C-alpha cells in the first residue's frame, strides 16, 4: 500500500470499512440489495434501492396501500372492504425493529476451523471464504441478535418477527469487531432510524469485551477504559440515541463478559493447528499473539492469573457503571434497562443439553462466543425480558396467520 497510485486505493477501502454502511446502496438509505460489504447480511434487504423513502422499519406511508414502503412484504388494499392490508393487520400491533450496537461477538466473528484443519480439508472447505472476507470475517446473518438464516434456539430478530410478522426485515446489526464505548459514536452515525418517520426499536448495547481488552503494547490495566470514561462515553451515546429513536423505543445495556472463562476452559486444550501433532494448546496461542503484540485481549488471554483477575474486576466495575446509568438516568424517547451477562445461565443451559463448556468458544480465535453460545445468550435475554419487562417485546399480533395467508413468506430475506 506504500506505492503512490496503490495507496490512494488503500485509503479508500479503509474508509468504506470504517463508515460501516453498505457499499452497494444506490439510494444511500444504508440498506442494500447485495449481502456482504455491510449489505443485507447486516440489515434488512432494501426492497427498493432506487428510493430512499423505501427501507425496512419505516412507518408505512398511506398504510402501504400503493406500495411496500417498509419492506415487510405487507401492502395493497383488500378489494373486499377497501382497507389497506397493513392497516387491517398491523395497526395497533406496535411493531418494532431490533438494533444491535455490538462488537465482534455481536457481529459473530468466526474463522472456520475447516480452513486450518488439514485432517478434514477439501475442495469444499474454502467455498465460504469470499463471503466471510467481505463480511469482515463476521457472520451477522447467523448471529444471535440479528441472524435470519438456517443455524449451522433462534435469534432475537426471528423471535420478534414471529411475535409480530409486521416486523419482517426490521433488523440492523451495527456491530464492528473493534467496537467499545470509546468508539461507539461512529456506530451511532451508521445507524438508520428517523425519530418521526420510523417504527420504534429495541437497541441492545452489548460491548462485552473491548473496553477491557486493549493494552496490546503496555500494561493492559493502564489501558482499560475507566468507569468515569465509560460513564461519559455511554451517556453521550444515549443522548445521541435519544435524537434518533422514535418515542416508545427501548435500550438495553448488556454487561461485559466473564472472560476468565477462556483461560479456565481452554488453557490445556489443543488448538485446531495443534490437533494433528498434539503440539499447540491455547496457552501457546495466547503467548504467541501476546508476544506479537496483537493479542485481541491481553488481560484475559494471559497466564498471569493476577492480570486476569484485574481484568475481570474492571469488567465487573464497568458493568456496574452501566447498571448505574440505567438505574439513574432517563431519556424522553426510550426506556432504559440493564442486564447482566448471563454467563451461568448459558453454561447450565448448555450442560443440560449434553454440552461441554469448551464447545461455547470459537475454536480458531479462543476468544469469542461461538454460534451456539450466542443463540443461548439470545434465548436467555428473550425469556428474561419477557418475564420482567414484557412491554419491551410487544404483544403477539393476532393477525400473524392472516399475514401469512395473504402474503406468504412476505418476500423472504
Amino acid at each position: 500500500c506504500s506505492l503512490p497510485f496503490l495507496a490512494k486505493i488503500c485509503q479508500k477501502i479503509k474508509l468504506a470499512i470504517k463508515n460501516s454502511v453498505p457499499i452497494k446502496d444506490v439510494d444511500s438509505d444504508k440498506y442494500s440489495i447485495f449481502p456482504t460489504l455491510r449489505g443485507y447480511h447486516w440489515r434488512g434487504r432494501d426492497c427498493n434501492d432506487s428510493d430512499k423513502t423505501v427501507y425496512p422499519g419505516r412507518r408505512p406511508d398511506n398504510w402501504d396501500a400503493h406500495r411496500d414502503s417498509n419492506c415487510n412484504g405487507i401492502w395493497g388494499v383488500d378489494p373486499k372492504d377497501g382497507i389497506p392490508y397493513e392497516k387491517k393487520f398491523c395497526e395497533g400491533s406496535q411493531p418494532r425493529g431490533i438494533i444491535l450496537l455490538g462488537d465482534a461477538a455481536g457481529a459473530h466473528f468466526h474463522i472456520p476451523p475447516e480452513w486450518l484443519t488439514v485432517s478434514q480439508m477439501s475442495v469444499n472447505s474454502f467455498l465460504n471464504l469470499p463471503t466471510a472476507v467481505t463480511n469482515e470475517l463476521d457472520w451477522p446473518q447467523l448471529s444471535g441478535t440479528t441472524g435470519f438464516l438456517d443455524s449451522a434456539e433462534n435469534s432475537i430478530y426471528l423471535r420478534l418477527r414471529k411475535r409480530n410478522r409486521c416486523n419482517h426485515r426490521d433488523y440492523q446489526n451495527i456491530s464492528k469487531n473493534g467496537a467499545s464505548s470509546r468508539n461507539v459514536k461512529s456506530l451511532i452515525e451508521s445507524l438508520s432510524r428517523n425519530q418521526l418517520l420510523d417504527h420504534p426499536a429495541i437497541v441492545i448495547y452489548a460491548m462485552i469485551g473491548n473496553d477491557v481488552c486493549n493494552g496490546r503494547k503496555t500494561d493492559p490495566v493502564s489501558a482499560m477504559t475507566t468507569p468515569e470514561q465509560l460513564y461519559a462515553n455511554v451517556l453521550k451515546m444515549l443522548e445521541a440515541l435519544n435524537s434518533h429513536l422514535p418515542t416508545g423505543s427501548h435500550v438495553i445495556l448488556y454487561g461485559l463478559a466473564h472472560g476468565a472463562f477462556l483461560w479456565d476452559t481452554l488453557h490445556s486444550r489443543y488448538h485446531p493447528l495443534g490437533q494433528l501433532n498434539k503440539d499447540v494448546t491455547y496457552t501457546q496461542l495466547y503467548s504467541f499473539l501476546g508476544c506479537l503484540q496483537v493479542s485481541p485481549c491481553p488481560g484475559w488471554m494471559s497466564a498471569n492469573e493476577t492480570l486476569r483477575a484485574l481484568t475481570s474486576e474492571r469488567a465487573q466495575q464497568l458493568s456496574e457503571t452501566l447498571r448505574k446509568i440505567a438505574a439513574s438516568k432517563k431519556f424522553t424517547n426510550f426506556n432504559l434497562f440493564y442486564l447482566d451477562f448471563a454467563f451461568q445461565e448459558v453454561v447450565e443451559e448448555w450442560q443440560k443439553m449434553g454440552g461441554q463448556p469448551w464447545e461455547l468458544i470459537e475454536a480458531v480465535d479462543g476468544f469469542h462466543p461461538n454460534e451456539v453460545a450466542l443463540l443461548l445468550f439470545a434465548d436467555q435475554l428473550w425469556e428474561k425480558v419477557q418475564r420482567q419487562w414484557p412491554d419491551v417485546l410487544g404483544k403477539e399480533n393476532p393477525f400473524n396467520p392472516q399475514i401469512e395467508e395473504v402474503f406468504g413468506d412476505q418476500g423472504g430475506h
Binding site: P130, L273, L276, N277, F288, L292, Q293
Partner: protein, 94 residues
C-alpha cells in the same frame, strides 16, 4: 509485521501439516492447497501462479525439515524486533 508473522505461521502450518497427512512434499501440498481454493476472486489462479513462480526458490532455502516458526523467521515474515522477545507458536527443539 506482527500481522505478517501470524499470517505466515498460519499458512506455513497448513502447508506443512497438509504435506504430513499425505506423505507429500511441500510443493505437492502447496499445489493441493491451491486446488482447494475457490475459482472466484482469481484466488486459485493467483495461488497457482504464486506457487510455481516462487515456491521452489523458497524451498531451496531449506536443506532441513523445520517447523513454521523457523520458515517464517527465515523468510523474514517474523522479524525479531528490537526490544521484543522472540515469538513462536510451536514447541522449540531442546
Amino acid at each position: 509485521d506482527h500481522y505478517t508473522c501470524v499470517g505466515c505461521v498460519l499458512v506455513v502450518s497448513v502447508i506443512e501439516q497438509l504435506a504430513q497427512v499425505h506423505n507429500s512434499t511441500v510443493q505437492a501440498s502447496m499445489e493441493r492447497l491451491c486446488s482447494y481454493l475457490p475459482e472466484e476472486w482469481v484466488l486459485k489462479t493467483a495461488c497457482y501462479m504464486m506457487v510455481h513462480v516462487f515456491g521452489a526458490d523458497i524451498i531451496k532455502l531449506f536443506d532441513k525439515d523445520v517447523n513454521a516458526d523457523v520458515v517464517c523467521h527465515t523468510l523474514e515474515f517474523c522479524k525479531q524486533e528490537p526490544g521484543q522477545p522472540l515469538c513462536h507458536l510451536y514447541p522449540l527443539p531442546k
